[PDB]
Ligand binder design. Structure first.
Ligand code: 5E9
Length: 181
């Protein structure tokens, strides 16, 4: 096995989970300890369904920038025994671009799905069905419903969470390491 494939599969096995909220199916990224991240629009309630079981959410922090503008991420703290393998060191200190990224999706409807979205570029501002949103990046791939939460990855780096699309292009909320400090 090559190393790119080994890293994505390991991500699926240890960190990228199938979840459902009352808003539908999403891909969740577990980052470290009991800390995971979802797209804010998933609106996790007091419990969330993770793979095969209902898991209690102890805390949910919706991330905004300094202008109070939406970043489209929610940090959730889970009531579980598991500590996620810590992948914080694979998350850049600042929102970074990449070449030939792969989007890793894991949902009940789209299990263990690899989507070659190509180069990921700085985009910045995105208007999400009436909600202004900062710190996004963009890939010219026609992503679809059911793919939100998907993890944007390239050469052993975890750089974003899939949040939206327009039929031609897709957009992620950029990851930075300090969110998970
Ligand atoms: C992922 C979430 C989803 O499936 O919604 C139903 C649960 C999608 C992915 C989009 C859909 C089409 N292509 C994609 O990659 N995210 C959304 O649908 C997102 C809104 C958009 O993408 C808009 N372009 C819209 C016109 C389809 C959801 C969203 C709504 C409101 C917000 F404040 C933030 C996000």
């Amino acid at each position: 096995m090559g190393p790119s494939l080994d890293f994505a599969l390991s991500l699926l096995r240890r960190n990228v989970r199938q979840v459902q909220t009352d808003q539908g199916h999403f891909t969740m990224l577990g980052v470290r300890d009991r800390l995971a991240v979802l797209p804010r629009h998933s609106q996790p309630g007091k419990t969330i369904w993770i793979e095969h079981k209902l898991v209690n959410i102890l805390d949910a922090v919706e991330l905004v920038d300094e202008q109070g503008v939406n970043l489209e991420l929610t940090l959730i703290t889970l009531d579980t025994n598991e500590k996620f393998r810590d992948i914080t060191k694979f998350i850049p200190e600042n929102i970074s671009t990449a070449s030939d990224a792969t989007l890793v999706i894991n949902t009940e409807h789209m299990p263990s799905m690899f989507v070659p979205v190509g180069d990921v570029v700085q985009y910045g501002f995105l208007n999400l069905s009436g909600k202004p949103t900062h710190r996004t990046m963009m890939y010219n791939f026609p992503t679809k419903a059911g793919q939100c939460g998907g993890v944007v990855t390239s050469v052993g780096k975890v750089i974003g969470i899939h949040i939206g699309g327009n039929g031609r292009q897709g957009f992620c909320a950029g990851l930075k390491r300090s969110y998970f400090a």
